[PDB]
Write an enzyme that holds these catalytic residues in place. Structure first.
Site, PDB file in Angstrom:
ATOM      1  N   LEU A 148       0.855  -1.224   0.000  1.00 59.50           N
ATOM      2  CA  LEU A 148       0.000   0.000   0.000  1.00 59.50           C
ATOM      3  C   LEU A 148       0.867   1.240   0.000  1.00 59.50           C
ATOM      4  O   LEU A 148       1.990   1.248   0.517  1.00 59.50           O
ATOM      5  CB  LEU A 148      -1.085  -0.101   1.061  1.00 59.50           C
ATOM      6  N   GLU A 154      -9.135   0.667   8.661  1.00 56.06           N
ATOM      7  CA  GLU A 154      -9.513   0.636   7.226  1.00 56.06           C
ATOM      8  C   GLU A 154      -9.444  -0.820   6.830  1.00 56.06           C
ATOM      9  O   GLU A 154     -10.305  -1.344   6.055  1.00 56.06           O
ATOM     10  CB  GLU A 154      -8.585   1.509   6.411  1.00 56.06           C
TER      11      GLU A 154
HETATM   12  N1  LIG Z   1     -10.737  -0.540   0.936  1.00 50.69           N
HETATM   13  C1  LIG Z   1      -9.851  -1.516   0.661  1.00 50.69           C
HETATM   14  N2  LIG Z   1     -10.034  -2.191  -0.480  1.00 50.69           N
HETATM   15  C2  LIG Z   1      -9.124  -3.166  -0.762  1.00 50.69           C
HETATM   16  N3  LIG Z   1      -9.380  -3.814  -1.904  1.00 50.69           N
HETATM   17  C3  LIG Z   1      -8.120  -3.484   0.146  1.00 50.69           C
HETATM   18  C4  LIG Z   1      -7.215  -4.495  -0.120  1.00 50.69           C
HETATM   19  C5  LIG Z   1      -6.149  -4.763   0.739  1.00 50.69           C
HETATM   20  C6  LIG Z   1      -5.218  -5.907   0.283  1.00 50.69           C
HETATM   21  N4  LIG Z   1      -3.859  -5.425   0.185  1.00 50.69           N
HETATM   22  C7  LIG Z   1      -3.131  -5.425   1.279  1.00 50.69           C
HETATM   23  C8  LIG Z   1      -3.691  -5.786   2.520  1.00 50.69           C
HETATM   24  C9  LIG Z   1      -2.863  -5.754   3.646  1.00 50.69           C
HETATM   25 CL1  LIG Z   1      -3.269  -6.098   5.219  1.00 50.69          CL
HETATM   26  C10 LIG Z   1      -1.588  -5.393   3.608  1.00 50.69           C
HETATM   27  C11 LIG Z   1      -1.136  -5.166   2.365  1.00 50.69           C
HETATM   28  C12 LIG Z   1      -1.806  -5.047   1.181  1.00 50.69           C
HETATM   29 CL2  LIG Z   1      -1.047  -4.617  -0.290  1.00 50.69          CL
HETATM   30  C13 LIG Z   1      -6.023  -3.987   1.885  1.00 50.69           C
HETATM   31  N5  LIG Z   1      -6.871  -2.989   2.122  1.00 50.69           N
HETATM   32  C14 LIG Z   1      -7.879  -2.725   1.264  1.00 50.69           C
HETATM   33  N6  LIG Z   1      -8.793  -1.733   1.503  1.00 50.69           N
END
Ligand SMILES: Nc1nc(N)c2cc(CNc3cc(Cl)ccc3Cl)cnc2n1
Length: 186
Positions: free
Chosen positions: A22, A30
């Site tokens: 992210l 979130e």
């Molecule tokens: N609103 C929203 N929508 C999505 N599609 C999301 C997807 C993720 C998934 N990505 C992710 C997850 C974690 Cl814990 C750490 C690293 C990464 Cl890169 C995380 N937050 C999101 N929030």
């Protein structure tokens, strides 16, 4: 099968990732919102389906994959079977959606859900039919290398509120953000 949805968190400069992470520091509440929205099924005896591209699958921390309590489907033309821990594989989004109507899934899937990446959001967002976007607006610029597609507000209506979504400004780790829901039907 129930509703079709995208869910995303996006910076002011439309960023959704940087090198497969992210763009912003972790926002714990979130992520809780993302888990709750994607998991909470809208029927009995069913689970929601999550659909993601291959890079999005491998961007999710192993401890967090598959997304529990949801059916996990990965999109890839290179892979020849689902990755370790995933449940289904399709070559394309249209193929995945066709699968949800096969006997193996028809029964089982409530809401469908698209969790990224950019190209998967774009094709869903430009395909006719009834679609919602659950967008978290992270109200700061952050250096990114992958971006959310343009939201055409001629067709996507910003809803004035939605059950289960807070309407107020949120803040974690000094970063303000807000939840929005958009809906088109064309
Ligand atoms: N609103 C929203 N929508 C999505 N599609 C999301 C997807 C993720 C998934 N990505 C992710 C997850 C974690 Cl814990 C750490 C690293 C990464 Cl890169 C995380 N937050 C999101 N929030």
């Amino acid at each position: 099968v129930g509703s079709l949805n995208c869910i995303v968190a996006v910076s002011q400069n439309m960023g959704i990732g940087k090198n497969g992470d992210l763009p912003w520091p972790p926002l714990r509440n979130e992520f809780r919102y993302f888990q709750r929205m994607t998991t909470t099924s809208s029927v009995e005896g069913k689970q929601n389906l999550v659909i993601m591209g291959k890079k999005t699958w491998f961007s999710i921390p192993e401890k967090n994959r598959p997304l529990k309590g949801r059916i996990n489907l990965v999109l890839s033309r290179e892979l020849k079977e689902p990755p370790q821990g995933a449940h289904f594989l399709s070559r394309s989004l249209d193929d995945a959606l066709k699968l949800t109507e096969q006997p193996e899934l028809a029964n089982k899937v409530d809401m469908v859900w698209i969790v990224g990446g950019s190209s998967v959001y774009k094709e869903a967002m430009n395909h006719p039919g009834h679609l919602k976007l659950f967008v978290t607006r992270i109200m700061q610029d952050f250096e990114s290398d992958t971006f959310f597609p343009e939201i055409d507000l001629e067709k996507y209506k910003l809803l004035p509120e939605y059950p289960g979504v807070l309407s107020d400004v949120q803040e974690e780790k000094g970063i303000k953000y807000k939840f929005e829901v958009y809906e088109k039907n064309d």
